[PDB]
Design a protein around this ligand. Sequence first.
Ligand SMILES: Cc1c(OCc2nnc(SCc3cccc(CN[C@@H](CO)C(=O)O)c3)o2)cccc1-c1ccccc1
Lengths: 125, 125
Amino acid sequence: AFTVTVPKDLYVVEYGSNMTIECKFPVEKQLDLAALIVYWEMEDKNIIQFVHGEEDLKVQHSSYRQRARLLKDQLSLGNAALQITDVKLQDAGVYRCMISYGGADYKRITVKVNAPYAAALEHHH
Amino acid sequence: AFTVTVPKDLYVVEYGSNMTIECKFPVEKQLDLAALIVYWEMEDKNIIQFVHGEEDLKVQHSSYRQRARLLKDQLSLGNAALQITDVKLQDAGVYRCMISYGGADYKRITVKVNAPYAAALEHHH
Ligand SMILES: Cc1c(OCc2nnc(SCc3cccc(CN[C@@H](CO)C(=O)O)c3)o2)cccc1-c1ccccc1
């Protein structure tokens, strides 16, 4: 009954730009913030935890500090949108949006990051 | 808040033995089966899915059929206990118990499998 869907399972973004990863879940009538739980994570590193209508950055992995936010306006439309500003090469990998809202589901989203030689060279060292 | 806790985040088991990995969640009074969702997985392979008060093996990976059980007696005590009999080296890796019940959380559990040379040689192909 409850299915999470992702329009894009793959994103190809540029180094230093901003990215928005979308993750859709059904909302029948009006959004029950008390029943919504949203988890954004990549490779066992927690990015976002949204419970009771507020972000919890107490468990956010340090590499995503000051750069990751959940677009709360899109939530009432059934869209868990993760925005990452200043995309780094470390941001490449497999992301997971986990959503609980009556039912529970999750989806994987792969991010590849293109970079110029200088940025890639610094990441390599 | 609603938090899933695991007594042991690491299990060290012997090849061919049976293991039971525990995953605790709070129950206010008596377990409301209609509101409970239990998801067990290791490394993107589904082991157990408990929805609507019934096991769902429709997405269970073939390796875990007839070899994995959710102890339903422990569920009413707030313990989603996954029992895997005849542990193989392929069972080593990162497990996740995902639980939705008036809230949502999950925990990771690492299983290491000790095996004699013969079992390792067979796994080695
Ligand atoms: C999320 C969750 C639960 O979940 C239940 C469930 N039902 N079903 C599934 S498994 C989906 C699946 C399978 C295989 C491959 C994928 C990857 N998606 C691919 C598609 O192949 C892609 O689009 O790239 C995806 O879990 C259960 C309990 C709690 C929670 C929760 C915890 C914390 C926060 C919020 C909620």
